[PDB]
Design a protein around this ligand. Structure first.
Ligand SMILES: *[C@@H]1O[C@H](CO)[C@@H](O[C@@H]2O[C@H](CO)[C@@H](O)[C@H](O)[C@H]2NC(C)=O)[C@H](O)[C@H]1NC(C)=O
Ligand SMILES: *[C@@H]1O[C@H](CO)[C@@H](O[C@@H]2O[C@H](CO)[C@@H](O)[C@H](O)[C@H]2NC(C)=O)[C@H](O)[C@H]1NC(C)=O
Ligand SMILES: *[C@@H]1O[C@H](CO)[C@@H](O[C@H]2O[C@H](CO)[C@@H](O)[C@H](O)[C@H]2NC(C)=O)[C@H](O)[C@H]1NC(C)=O
Ligand SMILES: CC(C)CCC[C@@H](C)[C@H]1CC[C@H]2[C@@H]3CC=C4C[C@@H](O)CC[C@]4(C)[C@H]3CC[C@]12C
Ligand SMILES: CC(C)CCC[C@@H](C)[C@H]1CC[C@H]2[C@@H]3CC=C4C[C@@H](O)CC[C@]4(C)[C@H]3CC[C@]12C
Ligand SMILES: CC(C)CCC[C@@H](C)[C@H]1CC[C@H]2[C@@H]3CC=C4C[C@@H](O)CC[C@]4(C)[C@H]3CC[C@]12C
Ligand SMILES: *[C@@H]1O[C@H](CO)[C@@H](O)[C@H](O)[C@H]1NC(C)=O
Ligand SMILES: *[C@@H]1O[C@H](CO)[C@@H](O)[C@H](O)[C@H]1NC(C)=O
Ligand SMILES: *[C@@H]1O[C@H](CO)[C@@H](O)[C@H](O)[C@H]1NC(C)=O
Ligand SMILES: *[C@H]1O[C@H](CO)[C@@H](O)[C@H](O)[C@H]1NC(C)=O
Length: 953
């Protein structure tokens, strides 16, 4: 069946080389017709659409949350630290001698106040809206979310303890204690605040409120960072969080938030420049990561285009015959190199265009690296074809058409094998949950297929025209005005086969070198197999960005100085009867509630923050609700009047509403079903004052989704992750949170009247990205096994290879792949979707290294194994080296300047390892192992080629 394709491709090659210009036209027309569809490209840069599987669990959990509570707010942080400012001591009253940091000086706080109050009143022009966007339009106001003001926006900073009042910050009082008097300053209020932030009367001889201006308590971990435990006075970093209201991807209010974020960043860069010796400013907006990813994507297009220029230039001056110094410009193949690269770029653009016709949404991070891998695969085929056509000696009085036909018929089955193997590998690499890598894989897969279809028609027609322009004694690209003259046309043997015949093949196939090489490769396989175990599974941030980013400095500070990670909501899905006494007994953590309840379990989890990645015990709306419902003066009903048995708030101090919230309790307080359903909407819309410090509107306003009639559909309990620094930390944190949530639901599902489909799930904003890494290894190994299958299957069918031949190919592919993963674990390249699609591309590509040598060893007539190995090495080892290896390496070595750590790590280093191991195995190890245990001579395999050449000659 090999020689059948030989006959077909002989016929095809002849028929194409006979009609060059017609075939070039008929081949260019569909490429332009498909590649004109690039104008439909919907370039989506948003991280949730590229890097989350929309059918995964995390996305179903996110969808449920974002439905029942609205989406998660956009955090625009600033982490300030004064490194050169020396620590001092304070002899405070009510507390011991505290050692204060340099950052907790007064002038620095007045400078942070200036910045905070400047960013409050920041305004931007909105051309879509044709007005000035104020912060109040877009800011996340937890208290009073409808008709907000600039002094109602969620701005978490140390100076919230002084409600951003500059008079309260410079304020000093005289306090006498146990006979002795001392001057109390802002330090006393700060410390008393950082201890218990839910106070309205400071205890340090000052009637100073501790709650923020917007009316919620600021916990110390949100305001200060760099301390360790309850030693807040030694805080090294101040934090200033601007929380904006997040809206769905299609809301016209998201442009407003992003415009303000851009203005925030401009103001923060100006502020960073102004304060050089004083502060060390680091900052990010929510738009920062999407903007720093897409900045560097358009800055390394010169460094990408240079790769294809260099591959063109190598292929151009590595098929040119340099014998005499008079006909170099006639021998040099500039037209063929240019044409070959043009054909491959045609194929790539056709693929991108075809996929853009179906409305598939890509990103410039995806349409950047597609041409590289497709070209590194597609250039080798053209190189090997032209090399064979060059080496194949023309029969006497034979025309060029039949010669090109014969050369193509000779090398076409091998190129069909390569192209099919690589296309299948890419289309099996396109099973990834990540839509970005899926789009990449599918585009690359089709690009390789169209590359082959163009190489068979357009490039063969082009080679026919080049051969004609050469034989007519005209120049290459300086031709058609210059048929002048040359010395004798046909010259002797080349330098490539010269080297491979006289230096290499005798050296590699020495008495000693076979034993040494074989031993050394088995040792390398052993080391690689050992080292593959210490692979780091996870794509952390600080890789997506460049190395010159303002976000890297922010991430260094966010890792070093921060005291808690992202907040995790333990969302409770539908089918909990919260009203029942038995219901709310298993959620609360007060006197009378069940032991190992919801909040008790989270509390005890946070007691061990290293095992279960939680730093703070969960907030509880039900615990604070049954706390609110006490016979104290928090909720009271009018004893009589027009508002009889109606809620008089904690603010009014009249005698008319002296009646308590419910009856005179005889122990642990529990409201009845009617009492619960009536009094919960009051609790959730009660602002915490001095009189009643317990109130729902502050924290739990949005953490309960009531029905139209006052049934609780859902509810979320807000804990905080410990500071998560690596991708492994994020993944372990998700795993541990899920395990705890499963343990919680297991106990909550044993309550009378709970639906069995009831579930507690820990939704954090970074769940969708770091969920895949729970099961990337099994998926990856299944994928690489499914990619090793068709390689062998089609390698045994198409090439028509025997059993030993197929198994030697397979053994070599497995060896290359294990070596790649071993060196991945050594160099410090992580395991993820990007590394995985590179390894699947490697499984596909390594066939180009092994298959050519193994075939040309199989189709051999030399007496002894060593002679056949030498022949295979010299002829096809030289073709495979000069083609595959040296059209990979000049392309890869240019991506070493990419500047983006993602490409610089996963597409330079990993492809360099893949290429060099491919080279080493399929030019050092495969000749030796073929010379040892290669397949036996098949005379019919070579002798029937002559019943397939002459018959259709
Ligand atoms: C409480 O949860 C309900 C669940 O139905 C939310 O109602 C849905 O809201 C989403 C987003 O606005 C809409 O797409 C659905 O059409 C709504 N469904 C129904 C049945 O009305 C509700 O929005 C949540 N409460 C609040 C105030 O947002
Ligand atoms: C949730 O449990 C409460 C009890 O804690 C149920 O309220 C009772 O419902 C029964 C059935 O009609 C009535 O006879 C009682 O008068 C109600 N009050 C009690 C017993 O406290 C409530 O029905 C349950 N939720 C459901 C089933 O939807
Ligand atoms: C910030 O707080 C200060 C001090 O409380 C406010 O200054 C006023 O506060 C008093 C009571 O509200 C007023 O009666 C005085 O006019 C004044 N007190 C002093 C001693 O100056 C100030 O108004 C607050 N900030 C704003 C702008 O509301
Ligand atoms: C080595 C390079 C030049 C090979 C060609 C790569 C081409 C196909 C890539 C590189 C930059 C890309 C373009 C950059 C952005 C846009 C603008 C958009 O509104 C239409 C698509 C379009 C026009 C892209 C199409 C694909 C593109 C043109
Ligand atoms: C085939 C590849 C090279 C095409 C581009 C892959 C890109 C999109 C991949 C590689 C690394 C990934 C990023 C790394 C981690 C983060 C941080 C997270 O908070 C938002 C998503 C984001 C930003 C990921 C989005 C998708 C990502 C940028
Ligand atoms: C095919 C193999 C044998 C050679 C591949 C090329 C070489 C240069 C590659 C393969 C493995 C790589 C090394 C593996 C990891 C480290 C440790 C690090 O602290 C310094 C760089 C260094 C030393 C890498 C440098 C580049 C490297 C040596
Ligand atoms: C600074 O505070 C630390 C922490 O208590 C203490 O050990 C040390 O003695 C203090 N040094 C000075 C100079 O007061
Ligand atoms: C918008 O804000 C700028 C702040 O520089 C201000 O100067 C300008 O007057 C504002 N636009 C309008 C409509 O007043
Ligand atoms: C408080 O004591 C300080 C320091 O001695 C002094 O300057 C100030 O006048 C005193 N204030 C009052 C109210 O006595
Ligand atoms: C939580 O889960 C189990 C249920 O399998 C429960 O019995 C026990 O209290 C907890 N288990 C562990 C290992 O903490």
């Amino acid at each position: 069946t090999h020689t059948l394709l030989g006959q077909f491709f002989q016929g095809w090659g002849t028929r194409v080389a006979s009609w060059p210009l017609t075939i070039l036209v008929l081949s260019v027309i569909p490429v332009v017709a498909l590649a004109a569809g690039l104008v439909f490209t919907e370039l989506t840069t948003d991280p949730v659409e590229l890097w989350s599987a929309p059918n995964s669990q995390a996305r179903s959990e996110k969808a449920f949350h974002d439905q029942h509570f609205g989406p998660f707010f956009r955090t625009n942080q600033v982490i300030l630290t004064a490194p050169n400012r020396s620590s001092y001591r304070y002899d405070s009253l009510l507390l011991g001698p505290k050692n204060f940091s340099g950052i907790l000086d007064l002038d620095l706080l007045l400078e942070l106040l200036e910045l905070q109050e400047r960013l409050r009143h920041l305004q931007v022009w909105s051309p879509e809206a044709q007005r000035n966007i104020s912060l109040q339009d877009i800011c996340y106001a937890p208290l009073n979310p409808d008709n907000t003001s600039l002094y109602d926006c969620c701005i978490n900073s140390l100076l919230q303890y002084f409600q951003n009042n500059r008079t309260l910050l410079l304020l000093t009082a005289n306090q006498t204690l146990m006979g002795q008097t001392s001057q109390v300053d802002w330090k006393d209020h700060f410390l008393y605040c950082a201890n218990a932030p839910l106070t309205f009367k400071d205890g340090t001889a000052l009637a100073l409120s501790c709650m923020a201006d917007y009316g919620a308590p600021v916990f110390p971990f949100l305001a200060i960072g760099g301390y360790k435990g309850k030693d807040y006075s030694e805080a090294e970093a101040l934090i200033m969080t601007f929380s904006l209201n997040n809206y769905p991807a299609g809301d016209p209010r998201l442009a407003q938030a992003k415009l303000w974020e851009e203005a925030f960043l401009e103001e923060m860069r100006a502020f960073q420049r102004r304060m050089a010796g004083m502060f060390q400013v680091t900052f990010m907006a929510e738009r920062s990561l999407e903007d720093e990813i897409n900045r560097t994507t358009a800055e390394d297009l010169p460094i990408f285009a240079t790769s294809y220029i260099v591959i063109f230039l190598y292929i151009s001056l590595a098929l040119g015959s340099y014998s005499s110094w008079s006909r170099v410009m006639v021998d040099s193949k500039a037209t063929l190199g240019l044409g070959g690269v043009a054909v491959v770029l045609g194929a790539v653009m056709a693929a991108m265009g075809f996929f853009s016709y179906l409305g598939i949404r890509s990103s410039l991070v995806i349409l950047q690296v597609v041409p590289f891998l497709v070209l590194s695969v597609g250039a080798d085929n053209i190189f090997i074809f032209v090399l064979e056509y060059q080496r194949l000696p023309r029969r006497p009085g034979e025309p060029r058409e039949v010669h090109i036909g014969r050369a193509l018929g000779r090398v076409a089955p091998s190129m069909l094998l390569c192209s099919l193997s690589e296309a299948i590998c890419f289309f099996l690499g396109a099973l990834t949950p990540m839509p970005a890598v899926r789009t990449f894989a599918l585009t690359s897969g089709l690009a390789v297929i169209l590359d082959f279809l163009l190489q068979m028609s357009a490039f063969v027609a082009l080679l026919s025209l080049d051969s004609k322009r050469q034989e007519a004694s005209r120049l290459d690209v300086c031709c058609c005005v210059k048929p002048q003259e040359l010395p004798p046309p046909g010259q002797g043997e080349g330098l490539l086969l010269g080297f491979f015949q006289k230096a290499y093949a005798p050296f590699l196939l020495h008495w000693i070198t076979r034993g040494v090489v074989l031993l050394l490769f088995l040792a390398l396989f052993g080391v690689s197999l050992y080292s593959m175990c210490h692979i780091s599974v996870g794509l952390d941030q600080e890789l997506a960005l460049p190395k010159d980013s303002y976000l890297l400095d922010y991430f260094l500070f966010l890792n070093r100085y921060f005291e808690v990670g992202a907040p995790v909501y333990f969302v409770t899905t539908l089918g909990y009867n919260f009203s029942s006494e038995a219901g709310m007994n298993a959620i609360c953590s007060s006197a009378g509630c069940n032991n190992f309840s919801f909040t008790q379990k989270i509390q005890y989890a946070t007691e061990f923050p290293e095992q279960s990645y939680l730093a703070i015990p969960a907030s509880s709306w039900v615990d604070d609700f049954i706390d609110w419902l006490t016979p104290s003066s928090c909720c009271r009903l009018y004893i009589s009047g027009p508002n009889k048995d109606k809620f008089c708030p904690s603010t009014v101090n009249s005698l008319n509403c002296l009646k308590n919230c419910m009856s005179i309790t005889m122990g642990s307080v529990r409201p009845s079903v009617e009492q619960f359903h009536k009094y919960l909407p009051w609790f959730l819309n009660d602002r915490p004052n001095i009189k009643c410090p317990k109130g729902g509107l502050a924290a739990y306003s949005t953490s309960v989704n009531l029905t139209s009639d006052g049934q609780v559909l859902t509810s979320r309990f807000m804990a905080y992750h410990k500071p998560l620094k690596n991708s492994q930390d994020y993944t372990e944190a998700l795993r541990a949170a899920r395990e705890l949530a499963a343990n919680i639901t297991a106990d909550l599902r044993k309550v009378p009247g709970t639906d069995p489909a009831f579930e507690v799930f820990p939704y954090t904003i970074t769940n969708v990205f770091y969920e895949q890494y729970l099961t990337i290894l099994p998926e990856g190994l299944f994928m690489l096994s499914l990619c090793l299958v068709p390689t062998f299957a089609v390698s045994c069918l198409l090439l028509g290879l025997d059993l030993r031949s197929g198994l030697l190919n397979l053994l070599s592919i497995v060896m290359i792949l294990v070596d790649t993963v071993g060196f991945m674990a050594l160099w410090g390249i992580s395991y993820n979707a990007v590394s995985l699609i590179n390894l699947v591309s490697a499984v596909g590509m390594s066939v180009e290294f092994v298959s050519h040598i193994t075939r040309s060893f199989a189709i051999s007539t030399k007496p002894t194994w060593l002679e056949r190995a030498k022949e295979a090495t010299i002829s096809m080892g030289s073709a495979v080296f000069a083609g595959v290896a040296m059209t990979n390496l000049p392309g890869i070595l240019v991506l070493g300047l990419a500047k983006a750590q993602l490409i610089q790590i996963f597409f330079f280093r990993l492809n360099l390892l893949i290429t060099l191991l491919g080279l080493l195995h399929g030019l050092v190890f495969l000749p030796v192992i073929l010379s040892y245990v290669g397949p036996d001579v098949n005379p019919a395999l070579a002798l029937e080629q002559k019943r397939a050449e002459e018959a259709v000659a």
